[PDB]
Design a protein around this ligand. Structure first.
Ligand SMILES: *[C@@H]1O[C@H](CO)[C@@H](O)[C@H](O)[C@H]1NC(C)=O
Lengths: 49, 49
């Protein structure tokens, strides 16, 4: 999946207080929203614990 | 119009538009023009009724 012609804040995708784990390298989690990119690829699948 | 679509990208939904599905044989009453361009991979649509 890829998003274009759209706009988003990932803050709502963070304040759910339900995700068990979270990992993001390359950019700080709190200063990625103001930084602007071109396209975002979403890669969803299942895996064991 | 098609059978199935493979892995793909760029799905966009525009504003809703109403039409009449009844076809007649009379004279025309409207004129619609469309211009489609492709510069540096960027799609352009120009129209006016
Ligand atoms: C997924 O889509 C990309 C283009 O958006 C394509 O290059 C790739 O081959 C696709 N993957 C599969 C498994 O078809």
């Amino acid at each position: 999946k890829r998003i274009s012609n759209c706009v988003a804040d990932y803050s709502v995708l963070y304040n759910s207080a339900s995700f068990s784990t979270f990992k993001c390298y390359g950019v700080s989690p709190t200063k990625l929203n103001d930084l602007c990119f071109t396209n975002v690829y979403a890669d969803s699948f299942v895996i064991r614990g | 119009v098609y059978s199935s679509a493979n892995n793909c990208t760029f799905e966009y939904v525009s504003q809703p538009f109403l039409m009449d599905l009844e076809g007649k044989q009379g004279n025309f009453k409207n004129l619609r023009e469309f211009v489609f361009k492709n510069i540096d991979g960027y799609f352009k649509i120009y129209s006016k009724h």
